[PDB]
Amino acid sequence: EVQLVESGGGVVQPGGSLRLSCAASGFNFNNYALHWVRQAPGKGLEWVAIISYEARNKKYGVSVMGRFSISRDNSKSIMYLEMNSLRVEDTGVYYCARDLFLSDYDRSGYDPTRGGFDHWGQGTLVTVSSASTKGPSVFPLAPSGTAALGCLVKDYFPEPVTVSWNSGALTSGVHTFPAVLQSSGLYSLSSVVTVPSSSLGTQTYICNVNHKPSNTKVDKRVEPK
Amino acid sequence: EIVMTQSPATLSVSPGERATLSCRASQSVSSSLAWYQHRFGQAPRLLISGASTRATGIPGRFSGSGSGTEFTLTISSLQSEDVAVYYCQQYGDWPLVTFGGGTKVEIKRTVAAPSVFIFPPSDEQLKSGTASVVCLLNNFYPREAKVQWKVDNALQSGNSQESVTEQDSKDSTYSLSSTLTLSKADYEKHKVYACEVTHQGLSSPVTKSFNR
């Protein structure tokens, strides 16, 4: 029933600005400190900022101090994170979270053992980059009693792409790898599947790639050369 | 201000056995300590606050203990749905809360050497002016593996990238893909492309190669 819904993520150029929103429902918003927490690719959770229940006190992580500004509207139950002077290293997933600390104060007073972030938003992806939107090229990874084949989904921006095989009828043996950020600033992703080599003459194999940000769908059939 | 240090970095536990995670605070946090589960592709989930109080809906096989500067999270009867990164977080210093660096919990299984496959660049990609050579290490365990690229016996450095799947929940293995990026021109100047794989389940390195 408690719900935190985030919005406002997207692509921004280095030096640009972005405002994230956390819409709360199902609890007395005005009773809780709220925080922002982020996760950069391959790294652990990093605390970003806190705002007290009545918006009087705010603190910021050292990495974002002087650039980010946290605020809350205690009449529509929405928290905001204003991000200015964004850097490539600000890229990541951003979560809002509800803090239990001191929230039971009226009923039970000051108990510093009560705490923890008991509810989190779903996360919003922030991409800071000078790249421009581009759909991928899909290249086959041709097979040479188990054969492996796949597709190379190269040079797209921003995340994410989805990949299925035979429109979703083929899931056993599929591995779709995490994308990598290439030195060009474009992403690359591979998806592979292992199959019995016998099927190579018998069974058709097609990867279906969809890149929403560029409205690109590609279907690449993969066959021995 | 208060630094939280988790260990081990990766914890491997047999299905149905018990996972013990450790967290150390650089100074006392009394019992103002919380633990979180972070499953891949989901938001973090509170497990424990106050060092040992289970959060609502958290099953009793999760428990925590400790005060001052040493803490433990115990997960009994480990299940594949428990595979995740686990974080501790102190709030003794509230509002200056801080997270540990995270402990990855994985299912332990028998060692499995990778099946290795190499893929030349496609005819289609060559027209574009770039060439990508792909090496696949499939269904291996544990996660640690090394890939070395060789082009005409010359060891490549700095022109490859790799990434690794999450642990497969059915067979508890990992897969890894390494991509060597060359210009079409350089690709066409060389003959033998080889991927050399080192893994603890192989008594000696495995090499897959092709002539362009």
Binding site: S52, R56, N57, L102, Y105, Y110 | P95
Partner: peptide, 18 residues
């Protein structure tokens, strides 16, 4: 209000007793 006072103390690293 008492809550806000306590929080002002904690945001400013004031040591509370016992």
């Amino acid at each position: 209000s008492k809550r806000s006072f306590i929080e002002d103390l904690l945001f400013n690293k004031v040591t509370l007793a016992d």
